[PDB]
Design an enzyme around this catalytic site. Structure first.
Site, PDB file in Angstrom:
ATOM      1  N   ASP A  47       0.768  -1.422  -0.049  1.00 34.04           N
ATOM      2  CA  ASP A  47       0.233  -0.030  -0.040  1.00 34.04           C
ATOM      3  C   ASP A  47       0.943   1.320   0.022  1.00 34.04           C
ATOM      4  OD1 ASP A  47      -1.837   1.974   0.289  1.00 34.04           O
ATOM      5  OD2 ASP A  47      -2.730   1.173   2.043  1.00 34.04           O
ATOM      6  N   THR A  48       1.232   1.817  -1.273  1.00 38.86           N
ATOM      7  CA  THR A  48       1.742   3.183  -1.357  1.00 38.86           C
ATOM      8  C   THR A  48       1.016   4.194  -0.922  1.00 38.86           C
ATOM      9  OG1 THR A  48       0.757   3.247  -3.420  1.00 38.86           O
ATOM     10  CG2 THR A  48       2.761   2.296  -3.339  1.00 38.86           C
ATOM     11  N   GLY A  49      -0.363   4.127  -0.281  1.00 37.63           N
ATOM     12  CA  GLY A  49      -1.032   5.134   0.143  1.00 37.63           C
ATOM     13  C   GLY A  49      -0.913   5.099   1.743  1.00 37.63           C
TER      14      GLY A  49
END
Ligand SMILES: CC(=O)N[C@H](C(=O)N[C@@H](Cc1ccccc1)C[C@H](O)[C@H](Cc1ccccc1)NC(=O)[C@@H]1CN(c2cccc(C(C)=O)c2)C(=O)O1)C(C)C
Lengths: 99, 99
Positions: free
Chosen positions: A25-27
């Site tokens: 999850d880059t967010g």
């Protein structure tokens, strides 16, 4: 590897004797795992996202293996609906976004 | 481009002639923007996040230019804490995770 985004980028992680499926999850700034009874000291914390905040337990310097790549860092434990591998560990396994 | 993850992967997007900063978010199924005006019909919808569920407005077939790459897709508008580009649009711009 390369992971497309047609489906949720779920991968197998290892933490203790628990294999788990988690979102790359880059967010997410932080790694947040479903409730599990890890050993050692922790501190209470509240993390927010869509919908509001949840209460978590912050454990530090926890070894996690993500797709056979070793990492070690902070892990937040609490009532998240999904296991989330956040940027704090994604950088450690050399993860990038590319387009 | 290649984007590392030591910082949040925030990029400028263009939507309805307006520039906004938005998060490239592999942990999001959907694209969710902070409250704003968009033309056309919308449908009330609900989405869930780490802290619970919120009500959003669903706009279909909305062009967004993300880092100079064109997408046209579903954009949700509501009380998200940040502008989020989700997998529905990340796939359109050919975005992958690599490590
Ligand atoms: C169903 C789904 O995909 N939901 C998404 C979602 O909430 N995804 C979450 C993980 C999740 C949760 C429930 C069900 C499925 C998946 C992961 C996102 O990457 C999310 C994006 C985000 C970022 C910042 C604020 C709100 C939302 N990340 C997070 O929830 C955490 C929160 N968070 C963070 C850090 C610091 C401050 C804040 C504030 C101020 O809210 C939030 C962060 O870095 O990652 C929506 C964005 C569409």
């Amino acid at each position: 590897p390369q992971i497309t985004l047609w489906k949720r980028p779920l991968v197998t992680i290892r933490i203790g004797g628990q294999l788990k499926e988690a979102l790359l999850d880059t967010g997410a700034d932080d790694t947040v795992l479903e409730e599990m009874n890890l050993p050692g000291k922790w501190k209470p914390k509240m993390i927010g996202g869509i919908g509001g905040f949840i209460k978590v337990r912050q454990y530090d310097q926890i070894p996690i293996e993500i797709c056979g790549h070793k990492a070690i860092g902070t892990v937040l434990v609490g009532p998240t609906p999904v296991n989330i591998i956040g940027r704090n560990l994604l950088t450690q396994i050399g993860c990038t976004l590319n387009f």
